[PDB]
Amino acid sequence: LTYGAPFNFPRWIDEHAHLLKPPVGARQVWQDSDFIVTVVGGPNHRTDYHDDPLEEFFYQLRGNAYLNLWVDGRRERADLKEGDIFLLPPHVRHSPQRPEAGSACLVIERQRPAGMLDGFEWYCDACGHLVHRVEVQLKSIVTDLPPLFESFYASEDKRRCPHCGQVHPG
């Protein structure tokens, strides 16, 4: 049993509540597994969209959240009300908004193999064009993402929309 014995999930979540809020936001349950199993808390809003080459499973255990999506070339929104489950197909662009403190969402993903890249994207509030995209070989979510977001926020040119000139707020 390389990942240990069964354990009570509500108590695990209770015990890690202080990581389930800014600034950490989320905590991985088991390390170095093929299934990446995370609990995500809140509050947290964000402007980036995720392009995951594989499926994502959501089970909104506590509180309510929602996903900003690009569904059919249009800005759409999928609500994760408390008790909801959801399977997200590969490559659907999604931007999770988690407004509530104390919320908890079970999120299950797959380790990406070598050369299968994730994308992180920003779109213009005024004209809906892609403003900036970066692709990454994601090895640890908490380690390799913050500097990416930061370099976007720090660069006016990276936030400048190539279509209408509006500088994304970051």
Ligand X SMILES: Nc1c(C(=O)O)ccc(Cl)c1O
Report the interface residues with ligand X, using CB under 6 A. Answer: 26, 38, 40, 56, 96, 98, 105, 107, 109, 141
- Distance from C-alpha of 65 to C-alpha of 73, rounded to nearest angstrom: 22
Q: Is 161 in the site for Fe ion (CB under 5 A)?
A: yes
- Distance from C-alpha of 124 to C-alpha of 106, rounded to nearest angstrom: 30
Q: Is 5 in the site for a copy of itself (CB under 8 A)?
A: yes
| Phi, psi angles (nearest 5°) of residue 16 | -100, 15
Tell me: is residue 105 an annotated ligand-binding position: no
Tell me: is residue 56 an annotated ligand-binding position: yes
DSSP 167: B
- Distance from C-alpha of 152 to C-alpha of 121, rounded to nearest angstrom: 10
CB contact at 8 A, 136 and 50? no
For a copy of itself, the binding residue among 49, 58, 122, 123 (CB under 8 A) is 58
Q: Is 163 in the site for Fe ion (CB under 5 A)?
A: yes
Q: CB-hemisphere CA count at 13 Å for 54? A: 15
* 3-state SS class at 35: strand
- Interface of this chain with Fe ion, residues 47 to 66, rule: CB under 5 A: 50, 52
Angle at the Cα of 63 from the Cα atoms of 57 and 65, rounded to 5 degrees: 55
Binding letters toward Fe ion, positions 95-124, x by CB under 5 A: -----------------------------x
Tell me: is residue 46 an annotated ligand-binding position: yes
Closest distance of CB 50 from ligand X, Å? 7
Output the known binding site.
Answer: 46, 50, 56, 94, 98, 109, 124, 127, 161, 164
Chain positions contacting Fe ion, by CB under 5 A? 50, 52, 124, 126-127, 129, 161, 163-164, 166
Output the known binding site for substrate.
Answer: 56, 98, 109
